[PDB]
Amino acid sequence: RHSIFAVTHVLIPVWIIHYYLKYHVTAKPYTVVERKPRIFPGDTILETGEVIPLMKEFPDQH
Amino acid sequence: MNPFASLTLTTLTILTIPIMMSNSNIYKTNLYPNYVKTTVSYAFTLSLVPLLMFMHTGQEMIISNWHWMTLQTVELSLSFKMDYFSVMFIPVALFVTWSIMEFSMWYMHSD
Amino acid sequence: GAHLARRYLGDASKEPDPLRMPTFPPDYGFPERKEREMVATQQEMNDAQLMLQQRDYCAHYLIQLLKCKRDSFPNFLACKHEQHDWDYCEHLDYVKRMKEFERERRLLQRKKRREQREAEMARG
Amino acid sequence: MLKIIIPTTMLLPMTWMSKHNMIWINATVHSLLISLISLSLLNQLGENSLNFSLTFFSDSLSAPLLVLTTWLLPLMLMASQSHLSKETTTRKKLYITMLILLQLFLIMTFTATELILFYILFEATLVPTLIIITRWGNQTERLNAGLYFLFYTLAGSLPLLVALVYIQNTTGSLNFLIIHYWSHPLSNSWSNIFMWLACIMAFMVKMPLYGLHLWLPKAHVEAPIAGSMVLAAVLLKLGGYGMMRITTILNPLTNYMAYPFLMLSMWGMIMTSSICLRQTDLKSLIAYSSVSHMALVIVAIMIQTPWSFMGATALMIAHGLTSSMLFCLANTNYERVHSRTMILARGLQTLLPLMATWWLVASLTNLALPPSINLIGELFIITASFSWSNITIILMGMNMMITALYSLYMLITTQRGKYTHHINNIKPSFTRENALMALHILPLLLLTLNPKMILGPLY
Amino acid sequence: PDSWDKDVYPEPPRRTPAPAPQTSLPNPVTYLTKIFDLLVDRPVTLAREFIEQQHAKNRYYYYHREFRRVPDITECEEKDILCMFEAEMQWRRDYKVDQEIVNIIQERLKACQQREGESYRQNCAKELEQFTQVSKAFQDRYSDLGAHYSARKCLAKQKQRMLAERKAAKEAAAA
Amino acid sequence: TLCLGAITTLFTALCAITQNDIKKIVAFSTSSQLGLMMVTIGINQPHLAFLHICMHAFFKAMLFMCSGSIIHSLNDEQDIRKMGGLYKAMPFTTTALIIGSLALTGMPYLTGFYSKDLIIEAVNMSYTNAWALLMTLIATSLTAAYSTRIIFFAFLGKPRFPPLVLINENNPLLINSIKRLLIGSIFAGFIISNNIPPMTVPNTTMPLYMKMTALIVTIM
Amino acid sequence: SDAPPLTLEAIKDRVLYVLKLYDKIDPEKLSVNSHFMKDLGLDSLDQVEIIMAMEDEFGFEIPDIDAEKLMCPQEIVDYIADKKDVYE
Amino acid sequence: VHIEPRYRQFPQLTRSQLIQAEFFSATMWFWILWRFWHDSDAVLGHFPYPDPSQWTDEELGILPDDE
Amino acid sequence: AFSAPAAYLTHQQKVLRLYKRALRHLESWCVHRDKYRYFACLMRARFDEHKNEKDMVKATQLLRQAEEEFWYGQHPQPYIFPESPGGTSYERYECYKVPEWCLDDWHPSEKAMYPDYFAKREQWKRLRRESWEREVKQLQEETPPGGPRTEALPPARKEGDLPPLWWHIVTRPRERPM
Amino acid sequence: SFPKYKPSRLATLPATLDPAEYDISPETRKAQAERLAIRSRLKREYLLQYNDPNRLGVIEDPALIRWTYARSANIYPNFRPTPKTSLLGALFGIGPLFFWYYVFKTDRDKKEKLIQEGKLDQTFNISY
Amino acid sequence: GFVAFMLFMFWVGEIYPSYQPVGPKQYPYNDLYLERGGDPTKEPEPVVHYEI
Ligand SMILES: CCCCCCCCCCCCCCCCC[C@@H](O)O[C@H](CO[C@H](O)CCCCCCCCCCCCCCC)COP(=O)(O)OCC[N+](C)(C)C
Ligand SMILES: CCCCCCCC/C=C\CCCCCCCC(=O)O[C@H](COC(=O)CCCCCCC/C=C/CCCCCCCC)COP(=O)(O)OCCN
Ligand SMILES: CCCCCCCCCCCC(=O)SCCNC(=O)CCNC(=O)[C@H](O)C(C)(C)COP(=O)(O)O
């Protein structure tokens, strides 16, 4: 009975919402849309293995 | 699936549970204000996580979960924007509300 | 600043118009002007999704600052050199804009002197 | 459609052969069952209407109105049995018979395929209402009210009848399907102008349009509670529905014949909302609020757009529910203190907390709080009006402000402050009254979850 | 998922960068993500697997209704009520389908605007152009019809537009 | 938007400096800060305005709770003319309200600094209405003016409350809530400022007197 | 909690406390029954000032029509007790 | 913690409230001093403001008035 | 509030009320106690300067310019006690005041709780019922035929009488009812 | 001596600045006595019913009845068609109607003739 | 008087704005022609910036 509050007010609601989003909301197009991640020079793309080249050899005004 | 959407919606959803319990026995007891304050504190703690995700990768989202009605060419859906403004303001508001409810437990004791 | 006093209280015809400048050709007083170059390509800025107002001639330093912030996320006190470099590049851009303002006002004063004094020697 | 009509007709011998102490129970139970059965008409098609037979048809415009009528009968029975307790058995049965006959006429009116049958039932609804007002009203003014209720209606409807028969002489039919499929434009002539006026002014009087509305405060104030409930919730809408049917033959004349009515509706909407701010009688305030909402409905129908028609349908349903609830709320306090003066009984939140909650929710729906269907209809009408002309917002927004100003005003006057000291007969709320308020308010809120069911044919 | 057609609702190939840690500090996002997985996603997945197992034991189908093409209002006689009725019903169905086409294009536009972030003005040009074309065609077809629109009124509007275009072309051939 | 914000912030700050109810003074302070938010919207700095919203929430809520603790201790008295020397009698409340007033006035490296300091610099360094800029600077001075009024009248001097002293702030709920928002009002500015991506081009080059203008007008 | 419930003894003690700090009143011959006019030889202005001092003492002000006729400490104690619902 | 009224005397104080108030005042002051020691430019600016008058005509491209 | 008003205020009463208002507004202007004491002594001296004026026309005109000076120099935001008519707690607890007759409408289950309280309530109701007619008779006896002249009420005068019209004064809800 | 306060409709003259309260005649005192007597007689009439143990319900107030009746039902019988009432009715009842008609008709004429010319920018306007 | 004075002074401040002694901010690719709405098929007029 010590943590009975966090299992009925947090764990149960997040079970229902995650089930609802994962299997019902995302079953239709464009219901959950994220902006694409930022890509920087030198990054490696996980999906295709592509590598973005670096950025044009700064004049290096140090 | 990305935990971002589930956590952002759960933070908002769990705030409504005491409103559903307002007709229960706890509402007639003297433990109701503490229960509301604890719910708000838990909501703030949960909302801290999407903020960390955004500060890590700049993650933003829109969730159109429930389609309400279609007016010929205009679709009205229950949609939530989870950009920088929302995911930054929600924890700040929850933190302030938590402090103010704890303060109200003492300020309004004899009400 | 004092430029506002000169334009509003003094002769405005001798003072640059911030909305309408430069009016003199960029190659007028210079024999050879090197065109300002850009390091970051259009695709790199588009993929970084910087902002349409952050896509200036200092965008490459901003890109490295953003990448460094993302890479060392927990340590938010690690992107100091990149922040300094971006700030320095923006400061140089602002100094260039101040130089352009001063150049254009000097050119306009010199133009007024030459035109009205060749008129003065042309009226007698 | 007879599956609704015949049980309603059977309500009459059932109440006339019931035991003296069983009339209310039987009537309430069976009217509720009839409402449940009528709830099946909400399954609508889109393309075309449900054409049961040559005589009766159901549309996405008719079905919500029918359901509202069948639902309003049990609420009226519940609200009537308190102040009719001392009445004899025969007169109680006669009162219930008037209510049943009114429901029967309204149900047939909303589903008639042919315009003369619609007109005949439309006039037939007058007689039970007149009898109810002039026989069971409380004050001496009721008689005058009855006269005002009668001759305002007939002076509008008698020309319509003439126009109707004239139309059947030239078109050959008054069947609404034939009228809609074989519709032809109206030319710009004096004869066409007067036929337009004859086709429109009866529904204008029924709305009522500002300037033709003087019968409504009298009739709604002097009527008993069930009379006021049916007059505000359903009878006014007889105008709107009628207009939505008859404007199909009035194009393109309505393009310019509608200007005086639009000006009257917008300005008089402002005027009646302002009148609500200085009103000593609590029922009169509700009546004038109804006038303002119906003015907005008139604007919606006159501008002839799909968004305006949808908004008008939604606002008609929402206002019916809200105005009926407000009249019942006022009647509870009237039966407490036997006066309609708004400032007599004050601070009632201290003495009746749950009834205060009911008052608050009714006031919120009256001022169109989102996402209630009241605001859905109001916003659709306002958007269509803005498309009609951008300056309309100036009036529309103004109306919104004044509406809130009087709604909360009512709420603040009767519920807040301190109680009147000498009034010591304020008993706790009965279960009947609380249940009546709940049965008003819960369907209104549930309609928010499925708004299309009240958005009409244009959805 | 494969529930919807990817040609009707397209999306770009979804490039995501690989994590490139630059500090020895632990990443709280990854630890919280693992906790969320283990305590939320696994039980939800198990419940869904049970529900899908139950659905598999009871498999039945529903069908999309196909409507024949009937003659339209153009080849209906003036007072033939039956042909007019069927043509009007077909026209109403076509109007509904056109509304849903506009809805699909608007969904594409909205999803593009959200997906592109700060680059939406340049990277959603194709969606904007598609919506412009569809919106213009829809406005030509159905605008200004009014409260009681019918296939006859749409036909009259199209005939008026055709007359205007013919007169414009005829006077352009004279210049 | 810029002109509306400027007139709002200066008018409300001007009203605040003569008020005697503590809640009224803090409410006029809230109105003035909202006017500042509107002026930073008007110079095309929406992210800076949002940052000010987040920063101002902390110390304005803390200031209201400090006022509430004072009111509750003095038997529901809200007039500063009847609040005497509470500096020693209510030490934690005095500390919290001092820190909140310092955050409100833009004391460096506090929550209000990272927001307010930047807004003033951006208004100083933009093509802007001259009257609006002057009004914003005057309102910045008036902010310190009414903060001084609150502190001086409520905490300094000799007692002016009724002789039956009921002063008691030793309740864990009050102390803990104030403490939480106090830690917020001290560190949230730095944390949030360093943990967000740069959404603006920074003003890196400006004359020194223009750099120090906000502090100078506050000192005045 | 809030202030302790008020008692008649406390009200009387505080009224006499305030009166004994008034310079125009002899502290030792002042009684709860002393008339301000007949026994203490004060005038109407002194009575107004005494009423104001009592209002400051108890944090509430007495209307003039009531204040005009409080002519002895016992009358003030009774008025305060009746106003603040004190019975013991 | 039970605290009583005192009637025209300074109220009774606890040690906890005094130590917490002092601790948080000291925390604020230490934070300000520490940040100013490490991030002084944020108040004082980091880059020098140029003087436009110290710029020659050659580097700004102004001819000597005779062309 | 407890005293019946008279037809008019005497000159002495008007002068005293002006003195009180002026002192209160001076205290509003002079926030600090020592300064207020100094200027209140000055006000008292200036006020005593004309205490022994005999010509009532002169005293009346002096009162007139005193009122004019007060209206010109009053504090626009004077201090108000929290529960005074302009105060911040004026009618704050009015919503918690419930009339005693409401107790008659309680369900018998509600009255099953608190048996002793309702026994004493029945005793009080019996007292009021038994005293009403004597109160009415005393009011009729003591009232001049031309109706009452003021709103003052008489006390009880016999052995076991109660003062007429006492019930609603005695059974006030409370000042802090909840 | 000091600047004088002048009253207005929404900021009335204070009692202490009212000369009528300083120029007192015996008839003024007797009128005040009559006013107090009327108030006292009404107060006794009210309090005899308020404190009545056998009284249950509402104490009907004839003043409230008169006020509501005068505000509602007594108005038309006391109305007389007058140039003042005729002009006020004509103005306040008809002038706004033609004002709004002119405004809306002018706006719609502009919009319609601007649609005819093909210059209104109606792109993306498909809902109405 | 206060409101009229504020309106007049705001109008004056609009007539005589405040600004810094700088030239326009410069952007690389023809003032970001493709970024601000594109239309990449019409050869935009080249905006060239030079060092100073
Ligand atoms: C209290 C509220 C009651 C409800 C109010 C209902 C409002 C109904 C008003 C009807 C609106 C318009 C009616 C007819 C449209 C035009 C009217 C006329 O004024 O317009 C001019 C008409 O020209 C002249 O003005 C003739 C009309 C003047 C004679 C009529 C008397 C009007 C005086 C006002 C009487 C009050 C009416 C309401 C009584 C209660 C236009 O000139 P023209 O385009 O060439 O002719 C058009 C007609 N054609 C095409 C058939 C040829
Ligand atoms: C609550 C009060 C409401 C009052 C409503 C009164 C207005 C009703 C509208 C007019 C009523 C009678 C119209 C007749 C029905 C029209 C049918 C028709 O088309 O007949 C016309 C004939 O139209 C008429 O004759 C009507 C003329 C008016 C006769 C009665 C005059 C009464 C006063 C007139 C103005 C009042 C009407 C509008 C009042 C608005 C509401 C106050 C044409 O027929 P033909 O003879 O074949 O001609 C074809 C070639 N052109
Ligand atoms: C601070 C903001 C506003 C302040 C401005 C106020 C200006 C006021 C300045 C001075 C006021 C006067 O001169 S006041 C002039 C009034 N003149 C008289 O009163 C003459 C006759 N005397 C009496 O009637 C009694 O002695 C009486 C005095 C009543 C005492 O009576 P008791 O002994 O029976 O109490």
CSV table of N, CA, C and O in Angstrom, one decimal, chain D residues 166-217:
chain,number,residue,atom,x,y,z
D,166,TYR,N,-52.4,29.2,-54.3
D,166,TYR,CA,-52.0,29.9,-55.5
D,166,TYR,C,-50.8,29.1,-56.2
D,166,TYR,O,-50.9,28.8,-57.4
D,167,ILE,N,-49.9,28.7,-55.4
D,167,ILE,CA,-48.7,27.9,-55.9
D,167,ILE,C,-49.2,26.6,-56.5
D,167,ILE,O,-48.8,26.3,-57.6
D,168,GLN,N,-50.1,25.9,-55.8
D,168,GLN,CA,-50.5,24.6,-56.4
D,168,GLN,C,-51.3,24.8,-57.7
D,168,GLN,O,-51.4,23.9,-58.4
D,169,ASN,N,-51.9,26.0,-57.9
D,169,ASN,CA,-52.6,26.2,-59.2
D,169,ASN,C,-51.6,26.4,-60.3
D,169,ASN,O,-52.0,26.1,-61.5
D,170,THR,N,-50.4,26.9,-60.1
D,170,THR,CA,-49.5,27.1,-61.1
D,170,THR,C,-48.4,26.0,-61.3
D,170,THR,O,-48.1,25.7,-62.4
D,171,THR,N,-47.9,25.5,-60.2
D,171,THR,CA,-46.9,24.5,-60.2
D,171,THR,C,-47.6,23.1,-60.3
D,171,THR,O,-47.0,22.2,-61.0
D,172,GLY,N,-48.8,22.9,-59.8
D,172,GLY,CA,-49.5,21.7,-59.9
D,172,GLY,C,-49.3,20.8,-58.7
D,172,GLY,O,-50.1,19.8,-58.6
D,173,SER,N,-48.4,21.1,-57.9
D,173,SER,CA,-48.2,20.2,-56.7
D,173,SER,C,-47.6,21.0,-55.6
D,173,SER,O,-47.1,22.1,-55.8
D,174,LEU,N,-47.8,20.5,-54.3
D,174,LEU,CA,-47.2,21.1,-53.2
D,174,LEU,C,-46.4,20.1,-52.4
D,174,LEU,O,-45.9,20.4,-51.3
D,175,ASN,N,-46.1,18.9,-53.0
D,175,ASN,CA,-45.2,17.9,-52.4
D,175,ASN,C,-43.8,18.5,-52.4
D,175,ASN,O,-43.3,19.0,-53.4
D,176,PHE,N,-43.2,18.4,-51.2
D,176,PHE,CA,-41.9,19.1,-51.1
D,176,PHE,C,-40.8,18.5,-52.0
D,176,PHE,O,-39.9,19.3,-52.4
D,177,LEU,N,-40.8,17.2,-52.2
D,177,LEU,CA,-39.8,16.7,-53.2
D,177,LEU,C,-40.0,17.2,-54.6
D,177,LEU,O,-39.0,17.6,-55.2
D,178,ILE,N,-41.3,17.3,-55.0
D,178,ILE,CA,-41.6,17.8,-56.3
D,178,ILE,C,-41.2,19.3,-56.4
D,178,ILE,O,-40.6,19.8,-57.4
D,179,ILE,N,-41.5,20.0,-55.3
D,179,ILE,CA,-41.2,21.4,-55.2
D,179,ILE,C,-39.7,21.7,-55.3
D,179,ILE,O,-39.2,22.6,-56.0
D,180,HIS,N,-38.9,20.8,-54.7
D,180,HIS,CA,-37.5,21.0,-54.7
D,180,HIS,C,-36.9,20.6,-56.1
D,180,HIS,O,-36.0,21.3,-56.5
D,181,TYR,N,-37.3,19.5,-56.7
D,181,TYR,CA,-36.8,19.1,-57.9
D,181,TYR,C,-37.2,20.0,-59.1
D,181,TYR,O,-36.4,20.3,-60.0
D,182,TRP,N,-38.4,20.5,-59.1
D,182,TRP,CA,-38.9,21.3,-60.2
D,182,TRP,C,-38.9,22.8,-59.9
D,182,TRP,O,-39.6,23.6,-60.5
D,183,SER,N,-38.0,23.2,-59.0
D,183,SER,CA,-37.9,24.6,-58.6
D,183,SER,C,-37.5,25.5,-59.7
D,183,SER,O,-36.6,25.1,-60.5
D,184,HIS,N,-38.0,26.7,-59.8
D,184,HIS,CA,-37.7,27.7,-60.8
D,184,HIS,C,-37.5,29.0,-60.2
D,184,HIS,O,-38.1,29.3,-59.1
D,185,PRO,N,-36.7,29.9,-60.8
D,185,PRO,CA,-36.4,31.2,-60.2
D,185,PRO,C,-37.7,32.1,-60.2
D,185,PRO,O,-38.6,32.0,-61.0
D,186,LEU,N,-37.7,33.0,-59.2
D,186,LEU,CA,-38.7,34.0,-59.1
D,186,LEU,C,-38.2,35.3,-59.8
D,186,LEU,O,-37.1,35.8,-59.5
D,187,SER,N,-39.0,35.8,-60.8
D,187,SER,CA,-38.6,37.0,-61.4
D,187,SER,C,-38.8,38.2,-60.5
D,187,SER,O,-39.3,38.1,-59.4
D,188,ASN,N,-38.3,39.4,-61.0
D,188,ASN,CA,-38.3,40.6,-60.2
D,188,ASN,C,-39.6,41.4,-60.6
D,188,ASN,O,-39.6,42.2,-61.5
D,189,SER,N,-40.7,41.1,-59.8
D,189,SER,CA,-42.0,41.7,-60.1
D,189,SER,C,-42.7,42.0,-58.8
D,189,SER,O,-42.4,41.4,-57.7
D,190,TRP,N,-43.7,42.9,-58.8
D,190,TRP,CA,-44.5,43.2,-57.6
D,190,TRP,C,-45.3,42.0,-57.2
D,190,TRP,O,-45.4,41.8,-55.9
D,191,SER,N,-45.8,41.2,-58.1
D,191,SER,CA,-46.6,40.0,-57.7
D,191,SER,C,-45.7,39.0,-57.0
D,191,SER,O,-46.0,38.4,-56.0
D,192,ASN,N,-44.5,38.8,-57.5
D,192,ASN,CA,-43.5,38.0,-56.9
D,192,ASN,C,-43.1,38.5,-55.5
D,192,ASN,O,-42.9,37.7,-54.6
D,193,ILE,N,-42.9,39.8,-55.4
D,193,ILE,CA,-42.6,40.4,-54.1
D,193,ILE,C,-43.7,40.1,-53.1
D,193,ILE,O,-43.4,39.7,-51.9
D,194,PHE,N,-44.9,40.2,-53.4
D,194,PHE,CA,-46.0,40.0,-52.5
D,194,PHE,C,-46.2,38.5,-52.2
D,194,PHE,O,-46.5,38.1,-51.1
D,195,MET,N,-45.9,37.7,-53.2
D,195,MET,CA,-46.0,36.2,-52.9
D,195,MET,C,-44.8,35.8,-52.0
D,195,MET,O,-45.0,35.0,-51.1
D,196,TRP,N,-43.7,36.4,-52.1
D,196,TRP,CA,-42.5,36.2,-51.2
D,196,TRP,C,-42.9,36.6,-49.8
D,196,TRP,O,-42.7,35.9,-48.8
D,197,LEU,N,-43.5,37.8,-49.7
D,197,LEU,CA,-43.9,38.3,-48.3
D,197,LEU,C,-45.0,37.3,-47.7
D,197,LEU,O,-44.9,37.0,-46.5
D,198,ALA,N,-46.0,36.9,-48.5
D,198,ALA,CA,-47.0,35.9,-48.0
D,198,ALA,C,-46.3,34.6,-47.6
D,198,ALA,O,-46.8,34.0,-46.6
D,199,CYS,N,-45.3,34.2,-48.3
D,199,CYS,CA,-44.6,32.9,-48.0
D,199,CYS,C,-43.7,33.0,-46.7
D,199,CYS,O,-43.5,32.0,-46.1
D,200,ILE,N,-43.3,34.3,-46.4
D,200,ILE,CA,-42.3,34.4,-45.4
D,200,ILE,C,-42.9,34.9,-44.0
D,200,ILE,O,-42.4,34.5,-43.0
D,201,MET,N,-43.9,35.8,-44.1
D,201,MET,CA,-44.2,36.6,-42.9
D,201,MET,C,-44.8,35.7,-41.8
D,201,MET,O,-44.7,36.1,-40.6
D,202,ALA,N,-45.5,34.6,-42.1
D,202,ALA,CA,-46.0,33.7,-41.1
D,202,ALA,C,-44.9,33.1,-40.2
D,202,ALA,O,-44.9,33.2,-39.0
D,203,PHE,N,-43.8,32.6,-40.9
D,203,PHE,CA,-42.7,32.1,-40.2
D,203,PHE,C,-41.9,33.2,-39.5
D,203,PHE,O,-41.4,33.0,-38.4
D,204,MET,N,-41.9,34.4,-40.0
D,204,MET,CA,-41.4,35.6,-39.4
D,204,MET,C,-42.1,35.9,-38.0
D,204,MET,O,-41.4,36.1,-37.0
D,205,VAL,N,-43.4,35.8,-38.0
D,205,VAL,CA,-44.1,36.1,-36.8
D,205,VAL,C,-43.9,35.0,-35.8
D,205,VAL,O,-43.8,35.3,-34.6
D,206,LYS,N,-43.8,33.8,-36.2
D,206,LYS,CA,-43.5,32.6,-35.3
D,206,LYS,C,-42.1,32.6,-34.7
D,206,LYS,O,-42.0,32.0,-33.6
D,207,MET,N,-41.1,33.2,-35.3
D,207,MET,CA,-39.8,33.2,-34.8
D,207,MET,C,-39.5,33.8,-33.4
D,207,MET,O,-38.8,33.2,-32.6
D,208,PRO,N,-40.2,34.9,-33.0
D,208,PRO,CA,-40.7,36.0,-33.7
D,208,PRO,C,-39.6,37.0,-34.2
D,208,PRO,O,-38.5,37.1,-33.5
D,209,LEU,N,-39.8,37.6,-35.3
D,209,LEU,CA,-38.9,38.7,-35.8
D,209,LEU,C,-39.0,39.9,-34.9
D,209,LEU,O,-40.1,40.2,-34.4
D,210,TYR,N,-37.9,40.7,-34.8
D,210,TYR,CA,-38.0,41.9,-34.0
D,210,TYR,C,-39.0,42.8,-34.6
D,210,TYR,O,-39.0,43.0,-35.8
D,211,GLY,N,-39.9,43.4,-33.8
D,211,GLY,CA,-41.0,44.2,-34.2
D,211,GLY,C,-42.3,43.5,-34.4
D,211,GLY,O,-43.3,44.2,-34.4
D,212,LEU,N,-42.3,42.2,-34.5
D,212,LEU,CA,-43.5,41.3,-34.5
D,212,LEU,C,-43.5,40.4,-33.3
D,212,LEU,O,-44.2,39.4,-33.3
D,213,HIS,N,-42.8,40.7,-32.3
D,213,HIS,CA,-42.5,39.8,-31.2
D,213,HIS,C,-43.2,40.1,-29.9
D,213,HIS,O,-43.0,39.4,-28.9
D,214,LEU,N,-44.1,41.1,-29.9
D,214,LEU,CA,-44.8,41.5,-28.7
D,214,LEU,C,-45.6,40.4,-28.0
D,214,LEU,O,-45.9,40.5,-26.8
D,215,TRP,N,-46.2,39.5,-28.8
D,215,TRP,CA,-46.9,38.4,-28.3
D,215,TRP,C,-46.1,37.5,-27.4
D,215,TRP,O,-46.7,36.9,-26.4
D,216,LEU,N,-44.8,37.3,-27.7
D,216,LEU,CA,-44.0,36.3,-27.0
D,216,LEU,C,-43.8,36.6,-25.5
D,216,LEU,O,-44.0,35.7,-24.7
D,217,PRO,N,-43.4,37.8,-25.1
D,217,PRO,CA,-43.3,38.1,-23.7
D,217,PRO,C,-44.6,37.8,-22.9
D,217,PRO,O,-44.6,37.2,-21.9
